């Protein structure tokens, strides 16, 4: 029934945010205030496409 398309391992690499959960919780309110626009763009893409392979950028 057709092959499944998958991104290459090179396409999945990105600079990683490597702080623990407590750091994120401490900074969460200001992070949601400051980085709102790209996060909302990503969530809209995610909930409209219904496919994680289309919202990687």
């Amino acid at each position: 029934p057709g092959i499944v398309e998958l991104p290459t391992l090179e396409d999945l690499k990105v600079q990683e945010v490597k702080v623990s959960s407590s750091v994120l919780k401490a900074a969460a309110h200001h992070y949601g205030a400051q980085c709102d626009k790209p996060n909302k763009e990503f969530m809209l893409c995610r909930w409209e496409e219904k496919d994680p392979r289309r919202c990687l950028e």
């Binding site: 994120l24 919780k25 969460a28 309110h29 992070y31 949601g32 996060n39 909302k40 990503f42 969530m43």
Partner: protein, 71 residues
């Protein structure tokens, strides 16, 4: 040939001895106890109201932190 000496009651008489039932009343009225209980209940209700509303606000704050972190 001295006087007769025998175990006997003392001159005049022995002191009166109690025998009747003695159970004092020793209590508050029912109205006072009911009033104290109802007052305690109302005070507890109001304190719990304040604390539960504060806890609801705290839960909302934590949920908002999770929402911020989700993307």
């Amino acid at each position: 040939a001295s006087k007769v000496k025998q175990d006997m009651p003392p001159p005049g008489g022995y002191g009166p001895i109690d025998y009747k039932r003695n159970l004092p009343r020793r209590g508050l009225s029912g109205y006072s106890m009911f009033a104290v209980g109802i007052g305690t209940l109302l005070f507890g209700y109001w304190s719990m109201m304040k604390w539960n509303r504060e806890r609801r606000r705290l839960q909302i704050e934590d949920f908002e932190a999770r929402i911020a972190l989700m993307p």
